[PDB]
Each structure stands twice: as C-alpha cells, then as structure tokens.
Design a protein around this ligand. Structure first.
Ligand SMILES: COc1ccccc1/C(Br)=C(/NC(=O)c1ccc([N+](=O)[O-])cc1)C(=O)N1CCCCC1
Ligand SMILES: COc1ccccc1/C(Br)=C(/NC(=O)c1ccc([N+](=O)[O-])cc1)C(=O)N1CCCCC1
Ligand SMILES: COc1ccccc1/C(Br)=C(/NC(=O)c1ccc([N+](=O)[O-])cc1)C(=O)N1CCCCC1
Lengths: 140, 142, 142, 140, 139, 142
C-alpha cells in the first residue's frame, strides 16, 4: 500500500525529494525539542491538532526503534554486523524520519500554512542552479 | 521518554496487558483488512477522525519497516543472523503493532466508546475461572 | 477490462476474499431458495430494487449456462474430457456465482446495510485466533 | 426456472425470434462500445438506471466466458475438440448474448421508448415477405 | 503523471482509437488546413478558447518533431534509417496527432459540443449492421 | 513553425534565448515539481487558466519524447545510439521545454504579470558586471 504521510496535512513527499539529507537537524536535536511547550501537551489525553496525534506515533514508532536498536547491541553474537546496522538508521533512515518528525514540529510552532509558504519559496531556491542562487533562504 | 499511543482515546497498555499477546490476528491478516471500506478512504487530504491520521504512521512506520526488513534479507553476508530478525519483528514486536493496528481498525468500525465497552468485558472474561467462563468469547456483532 | 458486480452496493471481491470459497452453500441449494417469497416476485415488469434486476442475469447467465453444460454431456464424442467441465463449472467457478447469488439473495432478505454489517463481522471473526474464536459463527437472525 | 431478461424493461424475447442472427453487431464491436460515455459510468458505484445495473452482470457473466474460454486453450489435452467449442460461443451463444448486450446499449444512448418504437416498426418489416418489402428500415 | 489532453472538459482517447484509425486524414492534409482562416488567428496575442492554445504546442511540439526527426539519414549510417521515422509516426503516437489536430480544428467549425454529439452518432453507425443501418450518417 | 507559444501570453522566445540557457533547472527537477499541488489539479476536467491546458500538451508532447528516446536503443546497434540522443534534447530542442515548463509553473503560482516583471529586472543581472551588480535578484514571493 502506498499513502503519503503528509497528504492530508496538505503536503506531499513529492517536494521533499529536494530537501538535502543535511537539511533538517539530527534526530537528537529534535528529541530535545520534544521537551518544548510540547512535552506536556502530549502526555495528555487530547487530540487537539491532528498533527501531534500522528507524531505521537512516529515518536514511539521510533521510541521502539531506539528500544530495539539497543536490543541489537546486547543479544548479538556478531561484532562485525551490528556496526553496519546503526550506520543506516541514524543515517539513511533518520532521513526518511527526521523530516517526518521535524515537519509537524515546524508547523505547530508558528503555523501550518506559514510553512508551505516556505517549501514553495524553497522549492525554487533549490532547483535554480548554484551560480544563480542568492546567499540564504527567505523569512516570512 | 514514555507515553501511550492510546492516550487521547482514553486507554493504556495497562488494559492491553490483559489481552494475551497471542490474541491479535497476524499482522498480514490485518494489513489485508485495511482494504476494507476504510482503505480507499485514507488516500484523501481529509484528516477526519485522528484514528485515520495516527493509523498512517503505524502503517508507514511498518510499510517502511517491512520495506526495511526486506532490505536485510538482500544486503547481508551472515546467513546465521539473517533469520534472527523476524525472531523479533513479526514476533516479539509484531504485536507492538498488532495491538495498535487491530485497535484503530476495529475502533473505527464499531465506533470508539463501543470498543472500550468490549475490551472491558475481557477485563473480566479472562479474569474469571475457566470452569465457569463460557466457551465462546464475546465479540463485536451488532 | 475489470469491474465489480458489487459496486453500486458498496462492495468489492476484496472483502469476499475473506469468505472461504467453501462457505457459500451449493448452487442448487440456492437455486431452490430462489423459490422463496422472492421467486414469484421476479416475473413482474417491475424492476424494483436493482438486486432483482441484476439477479436475473446471474440466473440467466447460469440458467443458460447450465442449459449449456447439459449440451456438452450430449453432443460430445470424447468421454475423457467430458467430466473435466464440471471440474471448473460446479466447482472452480460455481462460487464465482455462489458469491453473487448468495449475496443478492440474502441482501434482499435482511435489507442491504444490514448485510454489510454482517460480512464485516467475519472480517474479524475468521481473522481472530481459533483458540478464542467462538464455536458458533454469527448469522442473520432478527 | 423461466424468466424473461427483458420483461421488466417492457420487452420480451417473444419478438426477438425474428431478429436475424446477422443483425446486431459482433461482440467485439460492442466491447469497444463499452468504452463509450459508458466506460466510466459503470466502474462507478451508482445504480443510476437499472439498465446497466444488469448489463454489468452480463458483461462479467461473459467477462468470465472470456476468462474461461481461454482456460480451455491452455489446460486441454485434446487439440480436436477445443476447435468446436469457441465455434459455438462466438457463434450460437454470442447470438443469445449480443442481443442481451446490444439491447441495453441502444436504449441508454437515446431513449428506451425510442427503441420499442422501432422493434414494432421492424416486427412488421421482417414478417412481411421479401418481394413485398421496401429498401431499408425506418428512422425516428 | 498520466492525464488526458482531451479530458480538458470531457473527452477520452478510447473513443478515438476506437474509431477507424484509417479515417483521420493525413497530417499534411491537416497542416495545409491549419494555414487556413485559422492560421492568421493563432498569431494574435490572445485566444477565445484553449483549443487555440493546446494547438500551438500540438504544432510547436510537432514542428520540433520533424525539425528533428529528419536527422536519421543525414550524417548518420544505417541500412534502415527511415523504417520507424515515417512508420512510428503514422503507426503509433505520431497518429495520435492526426486525431488530436483533427479534433480541435473541426471543434472550431460548427462548434464544440456539436462535435461530441457526432462521435457517438457515428461511432455506432459504423459498427451497426451495414445492411440494416441507414444509408446516411446522422447530420 | 513561424509561431510562438509565448506570444499568446505576451512573450517571445528571445526573452529566454538571451537568458542563461543553462539557468533553467534540469527537465527532471521541473517535471517533479510539476507534480506539486498542480499534479492532481491538471488531471481534473478544468482548464481554467490556459496555462493548464497548454501545459498538458507540453507534458504529453514530451511524454512521447521520453517514450521516443527509448526506441533509439531497442534493435538499434549504431556508433552513436545513445551519444547524440541527448545532443538536441538536453541541450537544444529539449530546452524549448525547460524554458516553457519552468515558465508556466512559476506563473500559475506567482500571478502572471508579476512573473514577467521579474525576469525583466533579472535578464539585466547577467548583463551587469559581477563586482558591481548586487548578488541578489530574488524571485519575490509576495
Ligand atoms: C524562519 O525560520 C527558518 C528559516 C530558514 C531555515 C530554517 C528555519 C526554521 Br524556524 C526551521 N527550523 C526548525 O524549525 C527546527 C525545528 C526543530 C529542531 N530541532 O530538532 O531542535 C531544529 C530546528 C525550519 O525548518 N522551518 C521550515 C518551515 C518554515 C520555516 C522554519
Ligand atoms: C436509427 O438507428 C438505427 C436504424 C436502423 C438500424 C440500426 C440503428 C442503430 Br442507431 C442501432 N445500432 C446500434 O445501436 C449499435 C449499438 C452497438 C454497436 N456496437 O456494438 O458497437 C453497433 C451498433 C440499433 O440497433 N437500433 C435499434 C433500436 C432503435 C434504433 C437503433
Ligand atoms: C459533410 O460533413 C461530414 C459528413 C460525413 C463525414 C465527415 C463530415 C465532416 Br464536414 C467532418 N470532417 C472534418 O471536420 C475534418 C476536419 C479537418 C480535417 N483535416 O484534418 O483536414 C478533415 C476533416 C467532421 O468532422 N464532422 C464532425 C462534426 C460535424 C460535421 C462533420
């Protein structure tokens, strides 16, 4: 089955192909962000905004990917393969995740629309070749 | 940090611990069940009940977990520890999803509250002695 | 080209795949059941519910399929491949009809929606483990 | 059991005995017609007119007669009988079918009554002997 | 990514390939027809309907086909440098144009919705029993 | 063929030929973006703004050029069956698209008039010396 996690929110990975894997901040940098004004706002039985409602999944979806990524470092009798495992999740999988995460965050913070209003202004800064590219990205 | 996916829906793994791991029907059986009247209604920009919303992740997290477990069975040189992955996935943790999955799924079929008023029955069904406990377990009918 | 007979009625073979082929009662048993309060009400210029309408074809297509299969058992010179017809008809595809048949039939007895709210139960009945799953399968009562 | 597939629609095979097997166009010629403004109008969950509602059956009723008429050309160890099979369906059975099909089609297209208004004007052109028969058939 | 250049209001491709592909007049017989009273009208910086627009590309896009498909037997080497050039065009995709083009054009003659009422009023008169069917195609 | 697809929108090829041919991002980068919030908007039966319609062609017109660069290596064994295939494409007669494409898209999302006024006060950059011209010339998102 193929569905777009963003779809409903009005987004689509179709435009996330651009975003360089070095864009969104490392996972931990976000995990700490969970302690924001959002920490409490989740351990509370309230749907509120469908945003977190889903995030809360990804969180644990990973909350397990971190409670299992450790079940590897222990019960494992092959000290030559467990070195090429975490070298995929925290790298090639954090990617198709850091976005999944970061996303929601940077939407509740200020506003949803206020975000798309960027992805677009970015989805032009990226394509447009280097030599033909100003210093940094937009603002409001 | 710990939390509960069944929060806003007024629930906790606590009551899940009642449900024997070997209860929720195999994952696939559920994935297929997705094709229900609820399948085609997911690929729509409308959030609707958070059940939908949340559900996606659980799916993705898996539909991107499976398309991950099928990555090891290809890019692996030690056939000794190749089969010790499903010894956790489809098994040890599969339920960690089967619970979620089954949950939402049903919860969406027969309303929400109409669900709790179910898992609560077992909170006494299983609890009671086998000598008395009926043979047929109460399920969702009408 | 592919389509689904259970379209306008909000259904798909998808949910039928759940129903074990060996579920729908033998064709004849159904043909006879046609003689129900719904039999005499077919030979009337009134379309009424499309169930009726559609039903006819399924019947004809068969009542002109059987009066066809009984054409081979007469005009055939190779008794070796004579019995390898029912090895598809009354068997391999008989269900392709038994499904339709049974479907409409019932669907007409206990309303429509009242039907989906049935096949959906099994979408969980069968799905659940045998150790828990009750002995008696829920059916149409009142 | 004996019922008239047309009955309800206000018709009856009683008058189709006339219609020469060479009348209605070959099956394929109709299958292609399915791609008309009717293609989409069926793969959609709408009863609309009881017409197609039934047709949709015949379609598959045959849709299977074409998915089984092929199960013969493969799993069959008698290259002398499968030659006298399709030489019945696409011939003596297409007959008691092409009509079953064609019918509906030529009813939704313009109108139902607008059809019977013909079967009658035809159910007179046919009987009436040859020598005593104009060039072609009517119109409106 | 798949769409339908005719469904820009209510038109499918099926109904085209459904019709005798032998029917749609050659391309040349259409270009020389474009240069008609409709040529000096695509030059204008505006249009009334999209037909005009859709047409430009339909042409431009094509005008870039030949202005390019002509490089098959120039400074190139091969025994059959023109086996798919004039073929693939009058056989596959290339013909789709003979359909497309043909379309818009007439669409500007007696009108638009006066055409659709034809495709049908014909897509049938063709498949109907050539012996019992009327002699004249409806309008 | 003597016409200009930009004329109807008030534009001439020159207005791009002088422009950095190598500017317009790869056809790829474009086709991808196209499927942004416009993808599902073109499939629909509404041409609304001609850009749409005209665009459809471009795609198709190309969707057969992509389907064409595939028959240039089937049963062909030439000394250049994949070397000059993209000599006119990703360079000459293939740019006609990069320009076109890029064009429309931007317009639909940035009004129209405000689109031109951009390139205008831009096709000047490349004309203005490096050390003097302010390294900016943004695409106003207002
Ligand atoms: C004008 O704003 C920006 C302008 C340019 C570039 C970035 C930003 C900022 Br805002 C963001 N960075 C974070 O929010 C963010 C979220 C979480 C963590 N974290 O994981 O701790 C770190 C950074 C950001 O990604 N956006 C994108 C959507 C609209 C604007 C904000
Ligand atoms: C005035 O009309 C006609 C006058 C004389 C003879 C025939 C016709 C035409 Br109309 C018809 N032919 C098709 O519709 C038809 C349907 C489907 C296919 N097909 O399978 O593609 C081919 C032909 C036709 O059978 N009728 C009978 C009912 C009233 C008039 C139309
Ligand atoms: C007397 O009417 C006819 C009687 C029988 C058959 C066809 C026609 C004619 Br008229 C047509 N031929 C062309 O338009 C046409 C347009 C452009 C080209 N072309 O590509 O050059 C070729 C043909 C035609 O398409 N229609 C459809 C709409 C109503 C008028 C007729």
């Amino acid at each position: 089955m193929d569905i777009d996690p963003y779809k409903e929110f009005g987004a689509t990975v179709e435009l996330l192909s651009f975003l360089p894997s070095d864009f969104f901040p490392s996972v931990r940098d976000l995990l700490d962000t969970a302690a924001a004004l959002y920490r409490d706002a989740l351990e509370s039985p309230e749907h509120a905004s469908p945003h977190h409602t889903a995030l809360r999944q990804a969180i644990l979806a990973w909350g397990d990917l971190m409670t299992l990524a450790t079940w590897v470092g222990t019960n494992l009798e092959d000290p030559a393969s467990r070195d090429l495992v975490v070298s995929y999740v925290n790298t090639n999988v954090g990617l198709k995740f850091r976005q999944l995460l970061w996303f929601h965050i940077s939407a509740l913070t200020f506003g949803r629309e206020t975000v798309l209003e960027y992805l677009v202004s970015f989805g032009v800064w990226i394509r447009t070749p280097p030599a033909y590219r100003p210093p940094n990205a937009p603002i409001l």
